[PDB]
Copies of this chain bind each other. A is one copy, B any other.
Amino acid sequence: RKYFVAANWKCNGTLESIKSLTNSFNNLDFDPSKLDVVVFPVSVHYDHTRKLLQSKFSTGIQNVSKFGNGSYTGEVSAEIAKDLNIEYVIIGHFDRRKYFHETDEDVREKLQASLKNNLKAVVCFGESLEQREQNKTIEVITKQVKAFVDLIDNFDNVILVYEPLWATGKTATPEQAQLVHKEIRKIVKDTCGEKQANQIRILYGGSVNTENCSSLIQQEDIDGFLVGNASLKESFVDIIKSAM
């Protein structure tokens, strides 16, 4: 499995900060055939970000519409992303499930729209603190994954992300994350096949920084990360280095 390190900038950035951040990123000499490195800027920052990053960096957007073109003011269709050659989309991120009523059905639909339009999708899921404390981790994750997993038609083109929502004051250990990842891979196996499960990249989408990154990626079933705030720093290159 090819390692996959992603920068989810979330709702952050200015033209000036992106200029200097991309410049520092460009200083990192890495081979894009040996690892995927994907930067997800804000929609309106996409062109700026794409032009400033060297070709070795892949790029994507943080959300995509479940609808095609039409009367959906404020939405970006998968067809539009295709026309702009936007390579990757994030689907089902915690933020969108939490604040924007995004459901498992929405996730399924968004993945389908993406795949129909040759987009690659980074799909997020994970259980809450209440769900973990009630010992429902596997129940919840199985439900969330089975909501979309049968639609994957290429196991390099869809990447899974485990978000430990429960970790609130709590922190997930690499050992705990590894076990969840192992369990996700088995769900993929039971539903899609063994070769398919061995092929699919499963990322850790909890808190990742320069300190913990190596302990996480060195776990057998953790194939990379979807990084939050640490990816807004020049030191993000040291996180990429853990995958090199």
Contacts and interface: CB of A to CB of B under 8 A. Distances in A.
A71 B206 CA distance: 13
Interface stretch (A79-87, A129-137, A177-185): A79-87
A71 B228 contact: yes
Given A100-B100, A101-B101, A11 B44 contact: no
Contacts of A8: 73
Interface in A38-73: 42-48, 61-63, 65, 67-73
A10 interface: yes
Nearest to A18: B83
Contacts of A84: 15, 44
Contacts of A14: 80, 83
Given A100-B100, A101-B101, A10 B70 contact: yes
A11 B69 contact: yes
A171 to B, nearest CB: 17
Q: How many copies of this chain does the complex contain? A: 2
Contact of A74 (B48, B68, B90): B90
User: Interface residue tally of chain A, by bracket?
Assistant: 35 or more
A231 interface: no
Interface in A77-101: 77, 80-81, 83-84, 86, 90, 93-96, 99-101
A149 interface: no
Interface string A2-29: 0000001011111100000000000000
A76 interface: yes
B11 A80 contact: yes
Contacts of A101: 100-101
Contacts of A77: 11
A44 B61 contact: yes
Given A11-B74, A14-B80, A44-B61, 13 more contacts: A10-B70, A10-B73, A11-B76, A11-B80, A12-B70, A42-B75, A42-B76, A43-B43, A44-B44, A44-B76, A44-B80, A45-B80, A73-B93
5 contacts: A11-B67, A11-B70, A42-B80, A44-B46, A100-B101
Interface of A: 8, 10-15, 42-48, 61-63, 65, 67-77, 80-81, 83-84, 86, 90, 93-96, 99-101, 228
A-B pairs with the 4 shortest C-beta distances? A63-B74, A73-B95, A43-B43, A11-B72
